[PDB]
Amino acid sequence: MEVNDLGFVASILFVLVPSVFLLILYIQTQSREGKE
Amino acid sequence: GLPWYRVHTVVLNDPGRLISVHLMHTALVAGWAGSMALYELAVFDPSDPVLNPMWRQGMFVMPFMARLGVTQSWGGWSLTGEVADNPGIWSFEGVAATHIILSGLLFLAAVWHWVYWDLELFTDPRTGEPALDLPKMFGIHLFLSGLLCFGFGAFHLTGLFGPGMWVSDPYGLTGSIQPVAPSWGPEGFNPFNAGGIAAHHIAAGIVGIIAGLFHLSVRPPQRLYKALRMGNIETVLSSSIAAVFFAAFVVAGTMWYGSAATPIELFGPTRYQWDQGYFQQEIQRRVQSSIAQGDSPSEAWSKIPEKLAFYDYVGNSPAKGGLFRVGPMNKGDGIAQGWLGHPVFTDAEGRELTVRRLPNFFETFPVILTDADGVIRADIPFRRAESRYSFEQTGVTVSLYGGELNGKTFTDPASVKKYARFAQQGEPFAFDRETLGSDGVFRTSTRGWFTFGHACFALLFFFGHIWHGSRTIFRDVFAGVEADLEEQVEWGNFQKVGDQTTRV
Amino acid sequence: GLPWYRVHTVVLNDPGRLISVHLMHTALVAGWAGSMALYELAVFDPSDPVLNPMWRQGMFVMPFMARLGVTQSWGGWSLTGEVADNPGIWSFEGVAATHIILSGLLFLAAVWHWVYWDLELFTDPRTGEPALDLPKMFGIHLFLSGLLCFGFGAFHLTGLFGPGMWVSDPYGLTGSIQPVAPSWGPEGFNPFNAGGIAAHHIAAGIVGIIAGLFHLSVRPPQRLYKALRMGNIETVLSSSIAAVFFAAFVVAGTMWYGSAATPIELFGPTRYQWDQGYFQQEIQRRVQSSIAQGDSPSEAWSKIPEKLAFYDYVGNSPAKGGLFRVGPMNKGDGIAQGWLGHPVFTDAEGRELTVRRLPNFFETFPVILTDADGVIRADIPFRRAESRYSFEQTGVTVSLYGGELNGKTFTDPASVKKYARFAQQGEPFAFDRETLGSDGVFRTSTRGWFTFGHACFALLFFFGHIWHGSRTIFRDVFAGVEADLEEQVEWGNFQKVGDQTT
Amino acid sequence: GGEQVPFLFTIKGLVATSQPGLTSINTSTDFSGDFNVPSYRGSTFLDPKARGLASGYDNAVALPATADEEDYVNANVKLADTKFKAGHISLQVAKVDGETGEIAGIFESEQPSDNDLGAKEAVEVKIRGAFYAR
Amino acid sequence: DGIREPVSGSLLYGNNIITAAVVPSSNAIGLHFYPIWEAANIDEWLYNGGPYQLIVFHFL
Amino acid sequence: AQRTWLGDRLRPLNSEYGKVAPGWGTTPLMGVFMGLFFVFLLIILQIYNSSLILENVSVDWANL
Amino acid sequence: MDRSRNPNKQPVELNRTSLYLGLLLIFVLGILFSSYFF
Amino acid sequence: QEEETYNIVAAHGYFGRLIFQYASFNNSRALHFFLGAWPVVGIWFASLAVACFAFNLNGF
């Protein structure tokens, strides 16, 4: 079965690197909420 | 704090690090242009500039440095073909090499203003808050850009201290670098004349000079300073991206239709070469110049270069190619090997007949064969129950004139079906769909991908212009409205709407 | 707070979510075993179990569910070649499927104990701090494992309420599923007899029963409870990891050398089939049994199956293959097409001579051709200035007996060089290195990758056993030592070290 | 210009030089032209990096043991060619009696135990001869 | 299509999530109630329009 | 406040911050110059649409 | 020439429920665009 | 800080009880010299090995 040879690189960085951007920004808020 | 979409508003107050937050952005774009063009030099194939030229290899950035006078690339290969080479510092790498170190020297200066702010320059003397004058600074930004266009007009494009831009002939054959003369008349206003682009930045630069020489000396009026809110830093941010997406519409336009600043040898044909058949008006002209001149078809169709035959192909027209058929044009066809001539179709009677078909916004044109006035004489029968115009009953022959496979006729109607579809795509071409893994369906050139990526982005910069244009006029109301205001909104506020200084 | 390597120490105090923090780990391993074996069923090629069998396709988990009695694959292609009918519920698509839904039902129970803790079970009545009894609970963990081994011994491997394990013949040909009888004598202690593995978990299960029936009733002594620090959770964990490492050494061993619990048809040959030439002791035996019947060797070497020829290949021995030559064994050779017989080398005189070469820890053995006692008669000359034993001066012929290309001799010495290197790898085999993109250099089987991944991990679990064994004995001193202690360490001071009474 | 490195060979192996019509002796005008025979690059021992030569040296493969005898670049045969070459004369002194003048050699390129086909190279320089006689 | 031609719409059979489908029931059953038990086998079910009606009458 | 050698040459450049001409300023001098620009852009748009076609222009190829 | 401390840099406040919207939005764009990258 | 993070008197007689009591290192400034001696005087024998290998004075 034919494939574009590079979409699995492309659609694993398309899903991760904005979501771990988003997953970075939720933890910081939790620390701030704690007041630590 | 603040939400994630208003992160950069920390820099909106103090302009100490606002220089620094452009300067890593400026290091990121300069550290793209070297970082992409060095990759773009890693896949070139300079062995055949006539058969697979440099826009065939899907190459976005090496027309744009190439179309100002650079050629040599420390490999013995030059696009021009001009010899006696010895590049030195300005080759392809050397521009692309320089943008790495410049972006490194941009990034080291980008980290300097982040740690050092309040350098006695960003505040007024009236109080110590950080605030910078914008209209006095516009007179000193534009006077530098007025000097630099006047440098770019006369001192680079006209041979005084620099090589000229790219200029070709029409039907682009002998396109090389020579300094163009700035033509001042009305003839420089059509964009196919390159003499206007030299006369551009002299004349626009001299009024760019006389703008900024004027703009330093005067002050804006207070009926504009409170109106356009010129003390605010975001009022430069709206109405400069208005002047960017206005500026991005024209190179969405003038790349797509074509100009002298977008020639054929480094961008491809420009999609309107099939809607009139522009290149097919020439190779048909030269054989009828050679035809009646004193030369037969077969022997003629040979002083045509293969470069003219390569521009009369559907597979170099930039219409075809899709959004997600990704890669160079050589992933669509492979490497162009040879012309193998021009097909001429004859019946059992003569009655010469031709194929001039496949316009651009189709994908699968059904093959028709017609005569001079337009009555169909042959086609490919989709249902062979009631055929009356098929190939086999008519007995069409192929005369393949000129090229690689000159003089080889085909009378078997199983093989005429292959060259009929090849005649749909202008002139056929030999390929090799195994060296690069080319599949067989079309791609688009760098002229196609530019205008997609400069008109979709110019749509997006229109929305930021509405958004930043709202927030400048509506700065005070932006965190919500004052509470009631029921007397301003109810009807009977003498007479003009929204007036407190009235009967109300 | 705490550093990143001591994150899980929040669960060390309260055992309310300690059930929950295994239970998503248990859902992750059960939600691997279904999630891998469903991928492992997506690439099988069941069209030829004799030529490319299931360990040739680089398949880690489908021996392990397969070697207990499950062959119904849902497509009607039985693993053993005798898939009688619709298998019923227990095919690979099924068992794989269950482990998905079980891990889903494990994960939904894993989220339950995280939100609900202090369920009146984790504290003592003496005060309200969360603390659980470990040795009374060891008597009720092991009594369940003692019941479950005794179930696994008699009620699964012996045909009473279940199908038996995999058992083959030696020189594995007719390996299928039949219930094995538990042999109780000394003959069940050699691991090649499968009658011990049925007699295993009956006898180990009954003493697993009589352990946990004893272990509920008694209490540990206080000369051990303060010694082994048995009130602490960490000590138990250290003991468990240490025990596990011991258990991972044996299946690093008994997979690699081979046993009846690791047969050939679902793991491959076991690397000691070249150091004695184990399979080459059989196909050589059967043709000399065939000429003892009195048959000519052209139409002998044909009642040999191709399965015996496939086990006499270097490219199925699990020594070759590297650490980063990644993929199945079919990326090394391609698909096995046909045997093309066995080469027999003759000179111009006869003088029969053979190639039996390429041991396992080489990569490029130089081709030698020798006679019965060991004097070399032919080789491949690396320097043809002073050759005296080359192929061309000697004029070696090839008799290719049996197989696909039977009876086809080769007298041109350009083509003898190809079959001489093919004779180095036991018997040759036809391939197709274009359908899967196979490059041409060797890979290893699932028997090779298991023992790499179960002895390297067992090294790593030894270090955790030293590390957790330190922290149980040395809990009090673990955040640093009391300040001076200079009288405990200076000598001569009475009397024996660590005593405060001189 | 094109980023190959072809190994040129200036060989003089058995020139047998013809010459135009009847000369008394060379007059700083006459044309010497023929060919030699050229040798190879691999002089029967130049291994590649996987020890791949004909003349001894590990026939056709080392490491891919199952894709072994399929590759195509292991026929390593030598040749005894003939081509075109010209050599002129221009200076031709009298007492020390050394004659010099231009040359034009047209050779074959490398065949690195027969991978590629040859290229063609017009090598042109001064001859620097010296003549004496009985 | 109701003749023979088994049209694939499942992700294991080479098709994208844009191109995948439940790919509805056959023309030969018509408006018949075709459950999982009036099939003679589940291979007869899934070749002839089985799991479409399970995600229609349960869904509606 | 960090006085540098850069800052002693650009503080008279950014000295005035809100200093603004009263009266009317140069808005009629701005409007008479830039209404010509909109009709300049009206020339350029249909030179290129070929809708004010002069002689010897021929907005097309056969150019230089 | 000499450093100081910023009177600036407000932090960010991405909520718990706003993580769910952003995590879902990337995953529907994941299941939309991954066919087109193939 | 001026106070030590660790006591050398407890570290002395641990190692004094592991090996010979006489063969420990009582003072830390004599200890750290031997820490800075043993690879440093070692490796310029190996550096002088290759430097005496350089003149083809080889191993036996």
Ligand code: CLA
């Ligand atoms: C010249 C370009 C330009 C500049 C300098 C700004 C500057 C600004 N914008 Mg703005 N904007 C622009 C163009 C621009 N805009 C355009 C073209 C649009 C239309 C799409 C918008 C729409 C917009 C909105 C709707 C909002 C802003 C806001 C803001 C402010 C804060 C930005 C922030 O924290 O986002 C930080 C951004 C992120 C943390 C990540 C966003 C995710 C994006 C999609 C990733 C970008 C992809 C890639 C990295 C970029 C490559 C594309 C590039 C080549 C064009 C800041 C003053 C905000 C505001 O009002 O504050 C005053 C706000 O709400 N902008």
Ligand code: CLA
């Ligand atoms: C506008 C600038 C520009 C232009 C026209 C192109 C054009 C091209 N590049 Mg290029 N490139 C660019 C920027 C650009 N690039 C940048 C910035 C990089 C660095 C990351 C690269 C890196 C790069 C490489 C490494 C290569 C190319 C190649 C190519 C050529 C092949 C065609 C292709 O890949 O299209 C493909 C285009 C698409 C698939 C379209 C993408 C559409 C996006 C994903 C839509 C995003 C939607 C968004 C997620 C939704 C928003 C969410 C909403 C909620 C708001 C083509 C000429 C290739 C080539 O020929 O080089 C030899 C190649 O190998 N490019």
Ligand code: CLA
């Ligand atoms: C839907 C379109 C739209 C909207 C709502 C806005 C909204 C706004 N713009 Mg704006 N703008 C737009 C399009 C738009 N723009 C376009 C297309 C451009 C050209 C790139 C600009 C260029 C621009 C600048 C340069 C500035 C604004 C500014 C502003 C703000 C103040 C209002 C103002 O002066 O308007 C401007 C009025 C117009 C754009 C209307 C133009 C109508 C013309 C004069 C009629 C010409 C008709 C003519 C006979 C036909 C010729 C064409 C023919 C060949 C077809 C406001 C936020 C100002 C700002 O940022 O606020 C501080 C500002 O300085 N705009």
Ligand code: CLA
């Ligand atoms: C039965 C297995 C087991 C269990 C349950 C524990 C449990 C524990 N160990 Mg431990 N350990 C083990 C085996 C085990 N260990 C082994 C085998 C070793 C040797 C390598 C160690 C070495 C070790 C050290 C050196 C330390 C612990 C510590 C701890 C405690 C906290 C762990 C933590 O926060 O890390 C959280 C881990 C991370 C946030 C990420 C670590 C990065 C790893 C490499 C990623 C793992 C890769 C992958 C996901 C796992 C697949 C492999 C798996 C199939 C085996 C906890 C009580 C710490 C302690 O003393 O606290 C009391 C401590 O300092 N362990």
Ligand code: CLA
């Ligand atoms: C111990 C368990 C085990 C066993 C023996 C194997 C073995 C195998 N798998 Mg498998 N697999 C496993 C676990 C395992 N897998 C897990 C947990 C997953 C899920 C992620 C997979 C997913 C998987 C897929 C998807 C596929 C395989 C395939 C294969 C076969 C091909 C060979 C291969 O890939 O080796 C390659 C092995 C290596 C390259 C070695 C990796 C070494 C690591 C990176 C070293 C790590 C060092 C570390 C970073 C340093 C620590 C830092 C320090 C500071 C402490 C082979 C039989 C393939 C196959 O044949 O299936 C059809 C295949 O397609 N596996």
Ligand code: CLA
């Ligand atoms: C370098 C090896 C090493 C070290 C330092 C430790 C250290 C420790 N182990 Mg340990 N252990 C080891 C290897 C090691 N182990 C091995 C290989 C195993 C078998 C898997 C175990 C199994 C084990 C258990 C089950 C327990 C410990 C425990 C402990 C701790 C307390 C001390 C104790 O009782 O020792 C144990 C003493 C030994 C391991 C020495 C064994 C020496 C045997 C008896 C001699 C046999 C010689 C024999 C004649 C030759 C037969 C072999 C022959 C065929 C070659 C301590 C942290 C305890 C713990 O966790 O603390 C709470 C505990 O309960 N260990």
Ligand SMILES: CC(C)=CCC/C(C)=C/CC/C(C)=C\CC/C(C)=C/CC/C(C)=C/CC/C(C)=C\CC/C(C)=C\CC/C(C)=C/CC/C(C)=C/CC1=CC(=O)C(C)=C(C)C1=O
């Ligand atoms: C049969 C039965 C039941 C018998 C038991 C009963 C019975 C009768 C017993 C009697 C038998 C008996 C006692 C012994 C017989 C067995 C026997 C002879 C065993 C000996 C075997 C043997 C070869 C031992 C020698 C090996 C050994 C233990 C050590 C080697 C020592 C050596 C040469 C070098 C060690 C290297 C060295 C000097 C290290 C120190 C340098 C260093 C950097 C230290 C770091 C350091 C030091 C400090 O000082 C402090 C402060 C700090 C901070 C610090 O960093």
Ligand SMILES: CC1=C(/C=C/C(C)=C/C=C/C(C)=C/C=C/C=C(C)/C=C/C=C(C)/C=C/C2=C(C)CCCC2(C)C)C(C)(C)CCC1
């Ligand atoms: C330090 C220094 C240096 C260095 C420097 C460097 C090295 C730099 C780099 C630079 C670079 C390295 C650059 C580059 C960059 C890149 C980039 C920046 C990119 C980006 C991208 C993007 C932006 C994209 C986007 C997108 C996507 C994702 C896809 C498609 C579409 C779009 C477009 C959207 C030196 C030594 C010299 C000197 C000294 C200093």
Ligand SMILES: CC1=C(/C=C/C(C)=C/C=C/C(C)=C/C=C/C=C(C)/C=C/C=C(C)/C=C/C2=C(C)CCCC2(C)C)C(C)(C)CCC1
């Ligand atoms: C909700 C639910 C459900 C579902 C479930 C599921 C779906 C699950 C999943 C599961 C899964 C999905 C599982 C799987 C998993 C996987 C894993 C867990 C993996 C891991 C991996 C690893 C661990 C690896 C590691 C490594 C690497 C990285 C490489 C190699 C080496 C090593 C080994 C180191 C249902 C509906 C049914 C029911 C209801 C409930």
Ligand SMILES: CC1=C(\C=C/C(C)=C/C=C/C(C)=C/C=C/C=C(C)/C=C/C=C(C)/C=C/C2=C(C)CCCC2(C)C)C(C)(C)CCC1
């Ligand atoms: C200077 C500085 C700063 C800033 C920083 C930042 C924040 C930066 C950012 C940066 C960035 C933001 C960067 C980015 C870049 C880009 C990148 C890193 C990317 C790349 C990518 C790519 C390349 C992609 C993709 C791909 C691949 C790989 C495969 C397929 C194909 C493609 C091409 C698609 C400040 C002032 C604060 C201070 C300090 C320093």
